[PDB]
Structures are given as structure tokens and as C-alpha cells.
């Protein structure tokens, strides 16, 4: 059933630029405090939505033709919004619930925490410095960094689809590919996210297959509010 609900999904989004990978709720809650947790049960089908470098090109660029776009909106923002949408028409026997990774709940918090979702559906690795042996970074913010086996850094998490009254507790876990496995490198992948993300060097912690275009990376360069 799994299968044939990836199938729909994948029909739907993958010629845009996107990838899904499923999980079991459980998997992402039980990695997260009370506070982040999905409220529905374990063993419920989720999807993980992530975009690739061919997104741009196949689906923001068509989407910036339409008659959709509104004023001081993210137009990436309303392109993912509009396509999570479309999985929603591709399975009208179900109701579905959809949370992009750009939503924030009225205390500003985000509804998902993205990379714990794409690291337990084994789509991109997620490294912390908790995953770092001697942590050197002392009373600082270091932010953790999900590297894709395929594209490294060159991509996004864009949002999960939930599947409530579709339990699946057979789902096997598939654990996501530990493509920067040591120490030395993984410090190198946190302080090239954390401190020079701009020069996007970090996303080539793994040779990526595709990278994003000169326009893809000159939109991505332009700061939202000047877009
Ligand atoms: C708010 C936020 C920021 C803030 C704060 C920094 C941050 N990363 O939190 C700011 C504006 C500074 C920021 C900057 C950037 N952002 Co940002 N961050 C966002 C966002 C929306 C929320 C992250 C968040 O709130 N984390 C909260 C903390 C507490 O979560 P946590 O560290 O993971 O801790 C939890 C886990 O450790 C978990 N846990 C515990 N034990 C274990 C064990 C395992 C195995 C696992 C998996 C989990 C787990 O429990 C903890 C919670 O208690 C996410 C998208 C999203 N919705 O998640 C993007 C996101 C992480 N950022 C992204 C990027 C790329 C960036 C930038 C490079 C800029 C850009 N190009 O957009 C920069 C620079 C990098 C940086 N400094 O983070 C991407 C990263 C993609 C990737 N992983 O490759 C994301 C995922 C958005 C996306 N659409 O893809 N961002
Ligand atoms: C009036 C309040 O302000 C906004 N708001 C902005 N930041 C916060 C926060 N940290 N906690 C709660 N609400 C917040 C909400 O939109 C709410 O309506």
C-alpha cells in the first residue's frame, strides 16, 4: 500500500523537481521532545518532500508564469505551498495533512523540524555537533546540517505529508547514508554551514551529481525581501 501511495505522490511531484521518501511518525517523535511531536499515532504513514537543483528550472520558473502570485510572498514559498496542494487532488479518497518546512506555528516556532524528518526517512543525513566526539565549539549556536548521498548540500527540505488513518507499523527503518562518516570533516561541514554557508562550499561535502545553476544559486544569493 506504501508503494502505491509513493507511486501516486512521486507521479505528482517528481517531474517537478522534488523527491518523497516515507516514514512512521513514531520515528520522528520519539527523536524530539513532547514540545515537536506530530499529533497522531506512531505506526502513521508520513512522506518527507525535499526539492533538488531541477526544481528551479521545472517548477519554480513555470510557476512564476502564473496567476498565483501574490504581493510580499515568498514565490518559492507559494510554488512548494501550490504543489503540496496538487498531492492533496492526486489522492481525493484520503484526507491529508501537509506542513512545509517554511511554517511557523503564532509563537514563531516552526511546526516541523525538517532534518529530523528527512534523517528518519532516510533521505539525508542529519549531522549535529552531538555527532562530533570533543565538541570544540564551547557556549555558541551550531547548527545542524543534513547532507544528501546524491546532491551533498544541494538541495532543501521542503515538507512532510501526513497520511492520518494509514497506519503502517511493518514500515522498516531505513537509516540515511553516513556520507561524511569523521570527526575532522564533519567539524569542516558544521563550520562551513555555520559560519560561510554563503560561499555554498559546504553543500560539496559530498561530490554532488548536480549542483544548482549560476540564476538557480544568483535567485538563492538575493535576500527574500528582494525577490
Ligand atoms: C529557523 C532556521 C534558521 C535560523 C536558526 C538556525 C537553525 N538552523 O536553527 C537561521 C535564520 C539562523 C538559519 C540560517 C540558515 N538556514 Co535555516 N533553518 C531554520 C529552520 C526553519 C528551523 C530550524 C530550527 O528551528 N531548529 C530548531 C533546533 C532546536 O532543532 P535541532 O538543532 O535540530 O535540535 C533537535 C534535534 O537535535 C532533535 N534530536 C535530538 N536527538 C536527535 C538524534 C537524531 C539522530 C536526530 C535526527 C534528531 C535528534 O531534537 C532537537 C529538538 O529538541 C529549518 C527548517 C525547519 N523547518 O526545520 C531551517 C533550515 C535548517 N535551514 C536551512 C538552511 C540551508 C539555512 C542557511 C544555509 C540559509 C539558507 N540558504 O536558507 C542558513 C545557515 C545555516 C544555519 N546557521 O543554520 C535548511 C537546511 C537544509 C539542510 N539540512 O541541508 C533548512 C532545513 C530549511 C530548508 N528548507 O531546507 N535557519
Ligand atoms: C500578538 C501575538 O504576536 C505574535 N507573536 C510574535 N512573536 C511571538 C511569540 N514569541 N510568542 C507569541 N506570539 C508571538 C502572534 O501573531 C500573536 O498574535
Known amino acids: 500500500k ?15 523537481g522534488f523527491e518523497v521518501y516515507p516514514f512512521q511518525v513514531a520515528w520522528y517523535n520519539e527523536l524530539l521532545p513532547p514540545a515537536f511531536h506530530l499529533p497522531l ?15 528551479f528550472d521545472r517548477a519554480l520558473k513555470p510557476f512564476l508564469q502564473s496567476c498565483h502570485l501574490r504581493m510580499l510572498t515568498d514565490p518559492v514559498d507559494q510554488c512548494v505551498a501550490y504543489h ?31 532534518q529530523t524528518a528527512a534523517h528518519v526517512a532516510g533521505a539525508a543525513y542529519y549531522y549535529q555537533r552531538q555527532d ?23 538541495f532543501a527540505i521542503r515538507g512532510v505529508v501526513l497520511l492520518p488513518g494509514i497506519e503502517v507499523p511493518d514500515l522498516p527503518p531505513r537509516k540515511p547514508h553516513d556520507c561524511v562518516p569523521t570527526r575532522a570533516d564533519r567539524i569542516a561541514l558544521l563550520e562551513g ?3 560561510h554557508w ?3 562550499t559546504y553543500r560539496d561535502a559530498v561530490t554532488p551529481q548536480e549542483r544548482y545553476s549560476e540564476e538557480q544559486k544568483a535567485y538563492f544569493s538575493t535576500p527574500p525581501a528582494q525577490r
Open 2 to 16: 506504501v508503494a502505491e501511495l509513493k507511486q501516486k505522490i512521486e507521479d505528482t511531484l517528481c517531474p517537478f
Open 41 to 55: 499515532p506512531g505506526p502513521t504513514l508520513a512522506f518527507l518532500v525535499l526539492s533538488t537543483p531541477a526544481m
Open 84 to 114: 503540496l496542494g496538487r498531492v492533496r487532488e492526486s489522492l481525493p479518497e484520503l484526507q491529508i495533512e501537509i506542513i512545509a518546512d517554511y511554517e511557523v506555528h503564532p509563537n514563531r516556532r516552526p511546526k516541523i523540524l525538517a
Open 132 to 154: 562530533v566526539e570533543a565538541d570544540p565549539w564551547g557556549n555558541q549556536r551550531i547548527s545542524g546540517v543534513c547532507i544528501h548521498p546524491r546532491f551533498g548540500g544541494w
Open 193 to 195: 554551514f555555520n559560519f
Open 198 to 200: 554563503r560561499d555554498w
